[PDB]
Amino acid sequence: NTQEVFAQVKQIYKTPPIKDFGGFNFSQILPDPSKPSKRSFIEDLLFNKVTDLICAQKFNGLTVLPPLLTDEMIAQYTSALLAGTITSGWTFGAGAALQIPFAMQMAYRFNGIGVTQNVLYENQKL
């Protein structure tokens, strides 16, 4: 279930060192390197809200097997998908990753839903 869901890509994508996305703050969703275990600010809450017991059961005759994929590696898959979505937009899943500015990525996302690109360029501030 984790192989068919978490990891959709065979490559690792990273965000640029200088962050200017055009006024959008992704810091909350992206992993913070200052933390000891790599996670984002949203994942930090997701880990605290969701809850040794497994060792006592292991000795009681019920073995709890450790998962093949560690939680830290799961966070790296997401960070790679987040970096790709931001940097590569929609092009990393359909083939070779293409460099596009995120401002023009939304322009294509709006043209697909029936919104003229001019809306973004003019109202991008709001």
Binding site: K14, T87, G95, I100
Partner: protein
């Protein structure tokens, strides 16, 4: 001189995609591929 070894799982090749306002990449070539999928 081969034997069984234990290693950390590789998470995939490292790819750093450059990001800039005026930088864009337009594909100059294409490939049509055939994927095989089997279902019971």
């Amino acid at each position: 001189s081969q034997s069984i070894i234990a290693y950390t799982m590789s998470l995939g090749a490292e790819n750093s995609v450059a990001y800039s306002n005026n930088s864009i990449a337009i594909p100059t070539n294409f490939t049509i591929s055939v994927t095989t999928e089997i279902l019971p």
